[PDB]
C-alpha cells in the first residue's frame, strides 16, 4: 500500500493554527479532567495508539487512515480509556469539519505535548480518511507486562530503534494508568501534566518494589506513590537502555530534541509525503500568541 499525503483543498498553515489553538483553548478549560490531570496526558496516549498499529511490513494501519474512527478498532481492549479523548475532539472535528480524522487525532497529541510545557514538535497534514476495511485488526498494540526483548522486537515493527524507544517512553511522565482501563493503576510520578524528564529521574532515583495489584497484576511501587510498568521497569534491566535512561536523567535538552523527532517519525510512519508537499508545519502555543 501508498499512502501519499494530500493536503486538505485549499487549507493552509493559518487554517491548521487555528484547528490547534482550538483544542488548546478546549484544554485550558476543561481542566477538572481525571482529578484535575486535564485530557493532555490522554491525547498524548490517543495519538500514539493511532500511530502505533503500523505495520513496516505491508504499510497497513499507522496514523494516515483515521481508522481509529471505526468500531473494530475503537473497541480495541487496548484502547480502553481512548474514548475520552474522541469525546474530547468530537466538538472540535465538528467545528473544523474539513479537517481529516488522521490529522486531528495526530494534531492533538501534538498540540497536549506543546500546550504542556515541551518541546515543539513539527507537524505535517495530509492524512486521508480512509474505508472502514482498512481497519487494522486488534492486537496489534504493545502489551506491559513484558521486558526489554519483547519492547525492542516490538518497536521494531515501527522502525523505531533503541534510543527512538526510550525517548518516546519517557512519555510516561504524563497521566497515570487506570485500573479500570488498563488492569494497572498509579501515576509514573509528580508532575503529571507537565512535560520534563521526571520519568528518566524516577526510575533511577526511587527504590522500587515489585508487588500485584488489586488487578492481579504485577507492577513496581514505589513509596512516593508513584508505579512503573514491567516494560517501563525493562528499560534499566537492559544495558542498552540503561545508558539512555542515564543520559535523559541527566539532560532534559536532549530528551527534548530526541523525543520532537522520535514522535513525529512516529506519527508519519507509513506516509509518503510528495516532494511538492508543504514544509512540516512549526505552530505557536497559545502562550505565544498572547490567547
Ligand atoms: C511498550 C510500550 C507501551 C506500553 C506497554 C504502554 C502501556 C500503557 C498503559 C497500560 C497505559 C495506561 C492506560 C490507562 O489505564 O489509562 C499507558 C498510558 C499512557 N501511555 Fe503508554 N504505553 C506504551 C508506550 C507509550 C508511548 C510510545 C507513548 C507516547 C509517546 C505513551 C503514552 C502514554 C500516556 C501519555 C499515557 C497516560 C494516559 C492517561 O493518563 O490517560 N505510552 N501506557
Redesign the pocket.
Known sequence: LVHVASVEKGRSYEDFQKVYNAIALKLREDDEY?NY?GYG??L??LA?LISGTWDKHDNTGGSYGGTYRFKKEFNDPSNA?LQNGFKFLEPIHKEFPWISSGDLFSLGGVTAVQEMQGPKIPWRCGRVDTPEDTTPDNGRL???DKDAGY?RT?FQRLNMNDREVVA??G??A?????LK??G?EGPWGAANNVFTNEFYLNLLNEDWKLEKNDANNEQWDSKSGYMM?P?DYSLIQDPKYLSIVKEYANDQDKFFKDFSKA?EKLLENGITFPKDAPSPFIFKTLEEQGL
Open positions: 481525571d490531570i496526558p490522554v498524548v496516549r500514539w480509556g504493545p502489551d506491559a519492547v516490538f518516546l517512553m512519555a510516561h504524563l497521566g497515570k494508568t487506570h482501563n488498563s494497572y510498568l516494560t514522535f
